Design a protein around this ligand. Structure first.
Ligand SMILES: [Zn+2]
Ligand SMILES: [Zn+2]
Lengths: 111, 117, 211
């Protein structure tokens, strides 16, 4: 079981809303990490969709529509990407990442 | 351990067209190639939807997991996905057995094409 | 406005050395970290390393340390990735990207630089028919780089639009792909049907025997 789990595949009808799931392995607590999402259509470079820590701590990518939204299921160690009004151009590979912003130490190379 | 790790990613498919079964085809090794001591099976799977499918080759029923190369379902202009699968062998193996299948599976359905020398 | 532009595509033999570049514009280059992400064909993203153009603090990912070398020229707002001895397995696309406020998210992405490393050398494609005896195809094999384009033709000099192209496959260091024509059964009128292709290393026709 890796640190981050995403189901490999998903489908849904146009006009609809799906939720994508990024599950952080239980050796860590999502309560401190931020969830990041990237989109990548076939043959294109990834593009940063959004960052979500809480309703009061989030950021949308360069020119990413509001129909892409993030949420966090702390209790279930889950990060979510919700996409409403599903459109043909939403058809892509979606990658998640997670950043604590409180990663340190490593003074074990300078006594 | 998080920090700088990308998930494996979810392939999100948007369903915008009626379900369709693929028109599968199988092509045995050519000349110029067969008498060049090299075999290669071609299996083209076009005009389907959704663009999700899996290929299982099977010689005389028994599967083949050796030299099985497959392309990714690309979208054509008409808006139906296409695909290709190649199988490498020796002209000794080509005539040796008798059966060669391109068992395609799409949304439950199992189409199958067979050819022999 | 804010962008990262990467050098052109690359084709190299194993053991050669390589240096690709990623130039940024529209923002304060020395103020943001620039990472490099590798994406092998048909696979996901891999964080390779990161560099801070302000002072060139450079860091590497565990499975990339000692394999590659990241650097940066502040003056020309350019970041760099570099190999000493290329290996077949290094064949992949390479992205650079800018970190954001969320210093661990890459918000701006270069367009990518693909690098192909084959033991074989660049060559013109080879052709061959695809019959059984139903449709009929004509394939292409043994060629480099991936920059081919198919074209068919009847026995007489005339075009066909009853044709489509299938993606290319990397096998043994060379590429391959096919293209198939479908035709009305009511014939055997004819014997063959020309199969022409284009490539940077040579473009040849051929014929295609129909049942
Ligand atoms: Zn907690
Ligand atoms: Zn520094």
């Amino acid at each position: 079981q890796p640190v981050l789990h995403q189901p490999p595949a998903m489908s849904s009808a146009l006009g609809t809303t799906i939720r994508l799931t990024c599950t952080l392995r239980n050796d860590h607590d999502i309560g401190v990490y931020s969830v990041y999402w990237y989109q990548q259509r076939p043959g294109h470079p990834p593009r940063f969709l959004l960052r979500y820590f809480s309703q009061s701590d989030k950021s949308q990518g360069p020119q990413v529509p509001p129909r892409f939204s993030g949420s966090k299921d702390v209790a279930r160690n889950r990060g979510y990407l919700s996409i409403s009004e599903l459109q043909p151009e939403d058809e892509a590979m979606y990658y998640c990442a997670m950043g604590a912003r409180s990663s340190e130490k490593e003074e074990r190379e300078r006594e | 351990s998080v920090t700088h790790v990308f998930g494996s990613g979810t392939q999100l498919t948007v369903l915008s067209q009626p379900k369709a079964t693929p028109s599968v085809t199988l092509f045995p090794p050519s000349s110029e190639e067969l008498q060049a001591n090299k075999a290669t099976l071609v299996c083209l799977m076009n005009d389907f939807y959704p663009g999700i499918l899996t290929v299982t080759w099977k010689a005389d029923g028994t599967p083949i997991t050796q030299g099985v190369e497959m392309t990714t379902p690309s979208k054509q202009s008409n808006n139906k996905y296409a695909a290709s699968s190649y199988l490498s062998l020796t002209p000794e193996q080509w005539r040796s057995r008798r059966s060669y299948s391109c068992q395609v599976m799409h949304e439950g359905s199992t189409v199958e094409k067979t050819v022999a020398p | 406005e804010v962008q990262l532009v990467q050098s052109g595509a690359e084709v190299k033999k194993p053991g050669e050395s390589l240096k690709i570049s990623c130039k940024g514009s529209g923002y304060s280059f020395t103020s943001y970290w620039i990472g490099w992400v590798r994406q092998m064909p048909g696979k996901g993203l891999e964080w390779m390393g990161i560099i801070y153009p302000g002072d060139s603090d450079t860091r590497y990912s565990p499975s990339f340390q000692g394999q590659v070398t990241i650097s940066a020229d502040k003056s020309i707002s350019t970041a760099y990735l570099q190999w000493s001895s290329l290996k077949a397995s290094d064949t992949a696309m390479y992205y650079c990207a800018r970190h954001y406020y969320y210093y661990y998210g890459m918000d701006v992405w270069g367009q990518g630089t693909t690098v192909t490393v084959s033991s074989w050398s660049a060559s013109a494609p080879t052709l061959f028919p695809l019959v059984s005896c139903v449709a009929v195809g004509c394939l292409a094999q043994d060629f480099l780089p991936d920059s081919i384009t198919f074209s068919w033709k009847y026995k007489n000099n005339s075009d066909i639009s009853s044709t489509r192209g299938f993606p290319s496959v990397l096998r043994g260091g060379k590429y391959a792909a096919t293209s198939q024509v479908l035709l009305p059964s009511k014939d055997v009128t004819d014997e063959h049907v020309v199969c022409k292709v284009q490539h940077p290393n040579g473009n040849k026709e051929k014929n295609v025997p129909l049942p």
